[PDB]
Amino acid sequence: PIVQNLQGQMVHQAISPRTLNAWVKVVEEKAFSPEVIPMFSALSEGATPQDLNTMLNTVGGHQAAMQMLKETINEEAAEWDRLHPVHAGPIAPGQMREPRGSDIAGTTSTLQEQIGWMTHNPPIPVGEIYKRWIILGLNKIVRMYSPTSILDIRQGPKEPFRDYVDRFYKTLRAEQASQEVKNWMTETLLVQNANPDCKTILKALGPGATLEEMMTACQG
Amino acid sequence: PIVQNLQGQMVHQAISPRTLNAWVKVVEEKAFSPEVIPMFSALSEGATPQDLNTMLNTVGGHQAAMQMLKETINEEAAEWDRLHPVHAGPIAPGQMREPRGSDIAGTTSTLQEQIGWMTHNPPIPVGEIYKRWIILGLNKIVRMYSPTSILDIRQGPKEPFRDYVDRFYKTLRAEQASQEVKNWMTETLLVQNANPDCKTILKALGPGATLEEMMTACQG
Amino acid sequence: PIVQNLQGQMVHQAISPRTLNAWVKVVEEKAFSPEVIPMFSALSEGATPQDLNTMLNTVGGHQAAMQMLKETINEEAAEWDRLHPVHAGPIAPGQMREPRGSDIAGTTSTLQEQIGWMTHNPPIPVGEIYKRWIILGLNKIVRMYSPTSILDIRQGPKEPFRDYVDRFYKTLRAEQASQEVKNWMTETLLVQNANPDCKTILKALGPGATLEEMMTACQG
Amino acid sequence: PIVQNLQGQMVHQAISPRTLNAWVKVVEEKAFSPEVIPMFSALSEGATPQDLNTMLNTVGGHQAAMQMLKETINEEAAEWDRLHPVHAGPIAPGQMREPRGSDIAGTTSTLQEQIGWMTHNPPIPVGEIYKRWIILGLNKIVRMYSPTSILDIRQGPKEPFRDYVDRFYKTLRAEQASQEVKNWMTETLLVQNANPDCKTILKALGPGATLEEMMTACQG
Amino acid sequence: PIVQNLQGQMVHQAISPRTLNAWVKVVEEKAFSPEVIPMFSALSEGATPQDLNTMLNTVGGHQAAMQMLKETINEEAAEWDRLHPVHAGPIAPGQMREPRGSDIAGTTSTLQEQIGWMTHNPPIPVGEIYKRWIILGLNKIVRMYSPTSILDIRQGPKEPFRDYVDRFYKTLRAEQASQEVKNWMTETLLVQNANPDCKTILKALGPGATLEEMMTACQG
Ligand SMILES: O=P(O)(O)O[C@H]1[C@H](OP(=O)(O)O)[C@@H](OP(=O)(O)O)[C@H](OP(=O)(O)O)[C@@H](OP(=O)(O)O)[C@H]1OP(=O)(O)O
C-alpha cells in the first residue's frame, strides 16, 4: 500500500501477500460477524481503490453479499455523480479532472491516476470515500446475517445473567439504529428482560444506575 | 504504530497483522486474567489512540467487558475535561490545543491530529494517558472477573498444600490493594488457613520463616 | 530490546512479539526443567531490567515460584544495598549515581534511568546482575521442582539400561552440588543401581572405565 | 516530672503521691487495655529517666510482663550502645556526649546529670527516649496479652451490632498493624463478618459509605 | 491548659491529674448524658489541641464513638482546608501556613508550634476550632445514643406528672432541631400526652401555662 519511506516521501507499494492471505482466511473461516468491520479498517488504511477491489474479489463464496456491495457501490456512485456536477474544460497536468462514478470505484482508473489523486493538492480522499462505502456495505451485510432482533431476548429462569448481558450486547452491536434509540433500549430492555431477583435488585437500585453496580449487586 | 526511524525522525507505521492476531487470540482463548495486563503494555508501546481503539474493539465475545471499558473511558474523559478546563481563543500557529475528552478516545479526532501531537514540541503523551485508562479498566474488569475473594479460601484435608498455596497466590495477585496490605496478607493468611498438621509444624518453626522451608516442612 | 547501531550509538527498542510469544509458549509446554535455564539466557541478551520484569510477569501459572524469585530478588537487592557503598548528596553533572536495590529490580527506577545507565561511561551492568539473580532463582526453583532425589533411582528387571542412564543423568543434572562429588557419585552407584547381569558384566570389566565401553558391553 | 514555672525558672518537681496513687490504681483496676498508652504519657510527660524507672518499679504483680519489658529494655540499651559511637574518656569542655543505654536506663545516671542533659544546648531528651522505649514495651506487652484475633470475630444472630462493632474496634485498636492495613480492615472486615440481614442492607445501600449510615440502617 | 503568664507570653501547662480523673469518672458514670457537653467545656478552657487529643484518647469503652468522632474531625479538617485559602509559596514571618487535616489534629505539629499559634498576632484559634468540631461530634454521638423518639412520651395513669415533665424536658435538652419546632412541640405535646383530668384542666386554662402552674394544676 501507500507506505512512507524511511525519513522520506510517500511512495506506492503493492499489498503484501501475508496481509491479504490473513484477511481472506479470517473472513472465510468463522462468519460475517461485526468484528470484521474494525479489522478491515486495520488492513486497508492508505490503500488505493484497485487494491481494495483485489482484496474484495478474493473472497471464497458468499457471492450474494458481493452482489449487494456491488449494487450499493453503483448506487452510491450514481448519487455522487448527481450531487456533484461534472467540471468540464481543459485540465492542467498533475492535477487531473474530477473522478466520476467509475473512477472512484477504480474499475476504469489506473494506478497512475490513483497516485496522482493521492498526491494531488488539495488532497482527494477518494480511497476513504470508497472505504466508507465498503463500511456501509459491511453494515448491511451484518444486517443480512443477523440471526434475530433484540426485541426477543429473554434471560433463562436459571441462566446466569453474565451470558444474558453478553449476548444482549453482542446482538446490540449488530443492530442498525441511532445512538439515542440504542441508549434507550439498553436502559429499558435490560431491566425488562431479567430474572425476578435480578430485576427486583435493579428496581431497588432505581433508575440512573449503570450496569456496573447492577451486575455487581445481582451477583450471587 | 509509532516507531522511531533509525538515523531519522519518527514516522507513522501501519499495524502489523500478526501482532493484532496474536493479541486477539491470546485475549479470547485463555482468560481474563492479570497476566494479560503486562502483555498489553508489551503490544501497545508507542501507538496512537486509534491503534489502541482498533486493538480493543477487535475482540470477539465478552462484550460486557468492552461496554464497561467504554463507560470507564468516557468517565475518565469527563475527569480530564473537569481537571483541565477547555482553553478557548485562537489556535497557536503550529501548536494544536491539548486533546479534549473526546479527542483522547479518538472518536472525534482524525489520525493527523495524533500524528502532529506525537511529534510536537513539547511532546504530548495523550496516548500514554489513554493506555493508563485502559489499564485501569483492565484492572477493574479482572477484579470483577475473579469469582472468589481471599478471605474465604480454605484448604481441603485430602489434597497437598501445593495447589492450595498456588490458588491462594492466584487470588492474592488478582486483587488490587496497597503493597503493605499484600505483605500483611502473605505474612498472615498463608499460615492462618493451612491444614492443621502444617499449621502446627509452622507454629513450631516460628514466624519469620521463608516459603521454601514452609513448603519443605510438611511435604506429603 | 535496546541495541547498538553498527559503528553508532545505543538506541532503545521494544521487545519483539516473537520473543515474548516463544518464551511464554516454551514456559507453558516445557514445565520447569534444567534445559529451560539456558533458554532464558539465550532470550535476554542486551535487555533492560524493565524488559526482564515484563517478560517475567507475562508467565501464567506456577506463581509460587514467581513469588519465591521475587523474594530472592528483594533480598539480593537488600544485600547489594548493604554491601555496595550507597552514595548520596550532590551528584556530578552529566552523571547519575549507581542503581539502588529498588532500581535494579526495576520497581521504582524509570526506563530512562536504565537507558542512561547502560550508555553511561563506564557502563553499568545492572541488567546483567539482575539476570544472574534470576538465574540463581531459577536454579533454586528447579532444585525445588525435583521429582525425587538422586540416590533412590533403580533399574527394573524389564528395563533396558539406556533409558535408565538417561533418567539417571536427567536427575543428576538437576542437582546443585560441586563437580567433584558429582563425578564421584556418577562413577560408583551408576552400576550399583542396575540389573544384576550387566552389573556383574561391568564389574568384570574393571572398577571404573570410560562409559562408552560400559554401555557397549551392556548392549542387548 | 520537671514542670516549668510561670514568670520564674525551670525547677524540678518531686513526684507527688497523687500521681503515683492514680497510676497504681489505674494499673490495678484493669492492667490490660490500649488505654495505658495515652494515660501513661499523661502521667510522665517531661520526666527524667529516674522518675520513669521509679514508677516502673513501684507497680507490682504480673512479673512475667515486667521481666519481658525489662529484658527488652536491656536489649534496647545494647542496641543504643551499638548504633551510636561509644564515647569514653575525657569530654570536651562545655559539651557532653550522648548518654549510653546503661546511662539512659536510670541505673548509672544520677538526677543532676539528667538535669544537666535537659538544660544543655542543644537539649538531650534521654527521658523522652526512655519513655518511647517504655511505650514500645507496653505495646508489645498488650500484644502478648491480646486474647482474641480480629479475623475470628463472629456476630451472633441475636447479638446486637452495637456491642459487636464496639469489641471489633477494641480489638482493632489492640492491633499494632499499619495505618493503611487498619483502614482496609475497617473497610472490609466489619461487613465481611456481619449478620446476613445487615449485610444485605449494606449491599442495597452501597459499599463505601460512613459507618454511621451503616448503623442507622442496621438498627432492628 | 494555657495558664496566664505575667510580663510575657502565656506558657502551656500539662493537665492536672485530678482534672483528668474527674473527666474519666464523669465519662464512665453516664457517657451519653447531654450534661457532659458543658462539663467538657469547663475543663478545656483554652486547652491546646494536644490536651484535647489526650483527653479524647483517655476515655475507655465504646470505641465506635471514638471512630465516629475521629472521622468527623477528619472530614471537618478537610472542609476547613478546602474552604479557607490554602497558603502556598513564600510564607513570610508574622504568619504561617494553614494547618492541614493532620496539622490541626496535632499529630504532625510540635507543641511549641501550637504554643506559637496560640500566642500569634493575630492569634490562631486552632484549639477552639478543634473544640467546636469535637463538640459537634459529641452532639451527634449523644444523638446516636438516644434510643427513644420524642413523639412517643406518654404520661401513664399511674405515672405522676412530675416524672413525665422532668423526663420530657431532659430529653428535650438532648434533642437537636429548630427552635421554632421545639416551641411548637413543647406547647402541643405537653397537653397532648398527659392524664385526662389535668389534660382537661390545662385545656380550660389555655395555652401559655408555665411549669409551676401546670404542676400545681395536675396535683391531686
Ligand atoms: O519483524 P522482524 O522480527 O524483523 O521479522 C521480519 C518479519 O517477519 P516475521 O513477522 O515472520 O518475523 C517481516 O514480515 P512483516 O512483519 O513485514 O509482515 C519479514 O518480511 P517479509 O514478510 O517480506 O519476508 C522480514 O523479512 P525481510 O527482512 O526479508 O523483509 C522479517 O525479518 P527477518 O527475515 O530478519 O526475520
Q: Hey, which residues 22-51 in chain C have their CB within 8 Å of chain B?
A: none
Report whether D48 contacts D4 (CB < 8 A).
no
Cell matching residue A154: 429473554
Q: Which atom of ligand 1 is nearest to the CA of B18?
A: 10
Question: Which residues lie below 8 Å from residue C84, measured CB to CB, with a gap of 6+?
Answer: C98
* CA C99 to centroid of chain Cα atoms: 23
Query: How many residues would you count in chain A?
Result: 220
How many CB pairs below 8 A link B and C?
55
- With contact defined as 3+ CB pairs under 8 Å, the chains touching B are A, C, D
- What span, in angstroms and rounded, lies between the C-alpha atoms of D186 and D168? 9
Burial of residue E196 (CB within 10 Å: 0-12, 13-18, 19+) is exposed
CB A40, CB A136: distance < 8 Å = no
> What residues pair up with E100 in beta bridges, in sequence order?
none
The neighbouring-strand residues paired with C11 are C3
Structural element, H or E, at residue D132 = helix D126-144
Q: How many residues does chain D have?
A: 220
**Residue with C-alpha cell 495486563?**
B37
Q: What angle do CA E58, E64, E65 make, to 5 degrees?
A: 60
Shortest CA gap B192–chain A (Å) = 26
Q: Strand, helix or coil at B94?
A: coil
Ligand 1: atom nearest CA of C16 is 3
Q: Is the dihedral of CA B9, B10, B12, B14 positive or negative?
A: positive
| Pair B23, C21: CB distance under 8 Å | no
Alpha-carbon dihedral A42, A43, A44, A46, rounded to 10 degrees: 80
- All three cell numbers of C162, joined, read 539406556
Distance CA E133, CA E75 (A): 10
Grid cell in block for residue B193: 488457613
DSSP B95: B
d(CA E189, CA E206): 14
Q: What is the torsion angle, in degrees rounded to the nearest 10, for the CA atoms of residue E160, residue E162, residue E165 and residue E170?
A: -120
Long-range contacts of B156-164 (CB under 8 A, 24+ apart): B157/B195, B160/B220, B161/B194, B161/B195, B161/B198, B161/B215, B161/B218, B162/B215, B162/C64, B164/B194
B129 CB-contact burial (10 Å; exposed 0-12 / middle 13-18 / buried 19+): middle
B14: CA distance to ligand 1 center in Å? 14
Question: How far is residue E51's CA from residue E48's CA, in Å, rounded to a whole number?
Answer: 5
CATH 2.60.120.260 fits domain A148-220 = no
CB within 8 Å of chain D, chain E residues 52-81:
54, 57-58, 60-64, 66-68, 71
The residue type found at C62 is H
Residue C18 Ramachandran class (φ > 0 left, ψ -120 to 50 alpha, else beta)? alpha
Closest among D111, D122, D124 to D2, alpha carbons compared: D111
CA distance E161 to E166: 8
Can you tell me which residue has the cell 505575667? E6
Contact criterion met (CB below 8 Å) for B209 and C103 = no
Percent helix, strand, coil in chain D, to 5, is 60, 0, 40
In the CATH scheme, what is the code of domain A1-147? Answer: 1.10.375.10
Q: In chain A, which residues have their Cβ closer than 8 Å to the Cβ of B139? A: none
- Residue E21 to residue E28: CA distance in whole angstroms: 11
Kind of pairing, strands B2-4 and A10-11?
unpaired
Q: CA nearest D202 in A: which residue?
A: A217
Q: Residue D49: name the closest of D120, D107, D3 by CA.
A: D107
If you ran DSSP here, which 8-state letter would residue D77 be given? Answer: H
What is residue A89's three-state secondary structure?
coil
Chains A and E in direct contact, meaning 3 or more beta-carbon pairs closer than 8 angstroms: no
Nearest CA to D65 among D17, D9, D27, D107? D27
Tell whether the torsion through CA atoms of B77, B78, B79 and B83 is positive or negative.
Answer: positive
CA-to-CA dists, residue B7 to C6, C10, E79, angstroms:
11, 12, 55
Burial group, residue C141, by CB count within 10 angstroms (0-12, 13-18, 19+): buried
Please tell me whether residue D78 adopts helix, strand or coil conformation: helix
Is C88 in contact with C79 (CB distance < 8 Å)? Answer: no
Residue A10 has φ and ψ, to the nearest 5°, of: -70, 130
Any ligand 1 atom below 6 A from CB of A82: no
- Distance between CA E195 and CA E216 in Å, rounded? 14
8 Å CB contact between A44 and A32: no
The C-alpha cell at C49 is 531490567
| Distance from residue A51's CA to the centre of ligand 1 (Å) | 22
Q: Is C20 on the interface with B (CB under 8 A)?
A: yes
Cell of D39: 494515660
* Residue type, position B136, single letter: L
Q: How many CA atoms lie within 13 A of D128 on its CB side?
A: 6
Q: How far is CA A164 from CA A32, A175, A196, E74, in A?
A: 22, 17, 14, 44
Find the angle CA(B201)-CA(B205)-CA(B209) to the nearest 5 degrees.
115
What are the chain D neighbours of A217 within 8 Å (beta carbons)? Answer: 203-204
Assess contact for C105 and C77: CB atoms under 8 A: yes
d(CA C17, CA C20): 5
* CA–CA separation, A40 and A55 (whole Å): 10
CA-nearest of E19, E13, E74 to E43 is E19
Instruction: Identify whether the C-beta of residue E136 lies closer than 8 Å to the C-beta of residue E72.
Output: yes
- State if residue B16 touches ligand 1 by the CB under 6 angstroms criterion: yes
User: Cα-Cα-Cα-Cα dihedral of E148, E153, E157, E160, to 10°?
Assistant: 90
Q: Which of D123, D122, D203, D212 is nearest to D161 (CA)?
A: D212
DSSP symbols for A18-80: HHHHHHHHHHHHS---TTHHHHHHTT-TT--HHHHHHHHHT--S-HHHHHHHHHHHHHHHHHH
Cα D134 to Cα D138: distance, rounded to the nearest angstrom = 6
Cα nearest neighbour of A169 on chain B: B63
Angle among Cα A108, A109, A115 to the nearest 5 degrees reads 165
Residue B165, judged by CB atoms within 10 A of its CB (0-12, 13-18, 19+), counts as buried
B7 CA from centroid of ligand 1 (Å): 20
Which residues partner with B11 through β-bridges? B3
At A12, list the grid cell.
506506492
Probe site for chain C from B18, B211, B219 (most C CB atoms < 10 A): B211
Residue E110 DSSP symbol: -
CA angle E43, E49, E54 (to 5 degrees): 70
State if residue C110 touches ligand 1 by the CB under 6 angstroms criterion. Answer: no
From D119, D3, D51, select the one nearest E12 (Cα to Cα): D3
Is A74 in contact with A100 (CB distance < 8 Å)? no
Delimiting residues of CATH 1.10.1200.30 domain(s) in chain D: 148-220
Interface touch D204/A217, C-beta < 8 Å: yes
Determine the Cα angle at E132 with ends E128 and E136, to 5°: 170
- In single-letter form, the type of residue at position A183 comes to N
Residues of D in contact with E20 (CB under 8 A): 42
User: Could you tell me if the CB of A158 is within 6 A of ligand 1?
Assistant: no
Q: Whose CA is nearest to atom 23 of ligand 1?
A: A16
- Give the list of residues 6+ apart from residue E11 with CB closer than 8 angstroms, or none: D4, D6, E2, E3, E5, E115
- Contacts with C69 (C-beta within 8 Å, 6 or more apart), sequence order: C56, C134, C137, C138, C141
For CA atoms C164, C138, C58, B127, give the dihedral sign.
negative
| Amino acid at position C137, single letter | G
* Nearest-angstrom CA–CA distance, C104 and C76: 10
Residue B200 in contact with ligand 1 by CB distance below 6 A: no
Burial pattern E8-33, b for ≥16 Cβ within 10 A else e, equals eebebbbbebeebeebbebbeeebbe
Angle at A64 between CA A60 and CA A65, to 5 degrees: 80
- The answer to whether the Cβ–Cβ distance between B151 and D188 falls below 8 Å is yes
The CA distance from B137 to B130, in Å, is 11
Question: From the alpha carbon of B17, which atom of ligand 1 is closest?
Answer: 18
CA dihedral E63, E65, E67, E72 (to 10 degrees): -170
Q: Pick from B99, B106, B98: which is nearest to B49 by CA?
A: B106
Q: How far apart are CA C82 and CA C101, in angstroms?
A: 9
Lookup result for grid cell 468517565: B75
The rounded Å distance from CA B30 to ligand 1 centre is 27
Q: Are C24 and C62 in contact (CB under 8 A)?
A: no
From the CB of A18, is ligand 1 less than 6 Å away? yes
> DSSP 3-state assignment of B37?
helix
Determine the Cα–Cα distance for residues E146 and E174; give it in Å rounded to an integer.
8
CB contact under 8 A, A213 and D204: no
Q: In degrees, to the nearest 5, what angle opens at C-alpha A190 toward C-alphas A189 and A195? A: 115
- Beta-ladder partners of B92: B95
Q: A67 to chain B, minimum CA–CA distance in Å? A: 26
Q: Tell me the structure's resolution in angstroms, rounded to a single decimal.
A: 4.6
CB contact under 8 A, B38 and C57: yes
Burial class (CB in 10 A: 0-12, 13-18, 19+), B29: exposed
DSSP-derived secondary structure for A141-178: HHHHT----STT----SSS-HHHHHHHHHHHHHT--S-
DSSP B10: E
Distance of alpha carbon E197 from alpha carbon E195, whole angstroms: 6
Nearest to D111 by CA among D126, D129, D133, D131: D126
Q: Following DSSP, what letter does each residue of chain C receive, concatenated?
A: --EEPTTS-EE--PPPHHHHHHHHHHHHHS-S-TTHHHHHHHS-TT--HHHHHHHHHT--S-HHHHHHHHHHHHHHHHHHHHHS----S---TT--PPP-HHHHHTSSS-HHHHHHHHTSSS---HHHHHHHHHHHHHHHHHHHT-SS-SSS----TT--HHHHHHHHHHHHHT--S-HHHHHHHHTTHHHHTS-HHHHHHHHHH-SS--HHHHHHHT--
**Which among A35, A45, A162 has CB closest to B60?**
A35
Looking at chain B, which residues constitute the CATH 1.10.375.10 domain(s)? 1-147
Q: Which residues pair with E2 in a beta bridge?
A: E12
Grid cell digits, residue B118: 506525537
Q: Cα B165 to chain center, whole Å?
A: 24
| Residues D207, A216: Cα–Cα separation, whole Å | 11
> Which residues contact residue A6 at a Cβ distance below 8 angstroms, ignoring those fewer than 6 apart?
B5, B6, B8, B11
Cross-chain residue pair A7–B12, CB shorter than 8 Å: no
The span from the CA of C115 to the CA of C48, in Å, is 8
How close is the nearest chain B Cα to the Cα of A89, in Å?
34
Which residue from D minimizes the CA distance to A219? D203
Specify whether the CB–CB gap between E10 and E2 falls below 8 A.
yes
Cell of A165: 448481558
Report how far residue D123's alpha carbon sits from residue D95's, in angstroms, rounded to the nearest whole number. Answer: 11
Q: Which of B71, D191, B169, E93 is nearest to A209 (CA)?
A: B71
CB hemisphere CA count around A9 (13 angstroms): 2
Handedness of CA B16, B19, B23, B25 (dihedral sign): positive
Q: Which three cell numbers stand for residue A75?
A: 448506487
Is the previous residue joined to C122 through a cis bond, with omega within 30 degrees of 0?
yes
Query: Using an 8 Å Cβ cutoff, are A190 and A165 in contact?
Result: yes
- Which chain A residues contact residue D206 at CB under 8 A? 213
Distance from CA of A212 to the nearest CA of D (A): 12
Give Cα separations from D211 to A72, D87, E72, E135, E160 (angstroms). Answer: 63, 54, 11, 19, 40
Q: Are A126 and A84 in contact (CB under 8 A)?
A: no
Closest residue of chain B to D192, computed from CA coordinates: B151
Mutate to test the pocket of ligand 1, among C18, C19, C21, C43 (most ligand atoms within 8 A of CB): C18
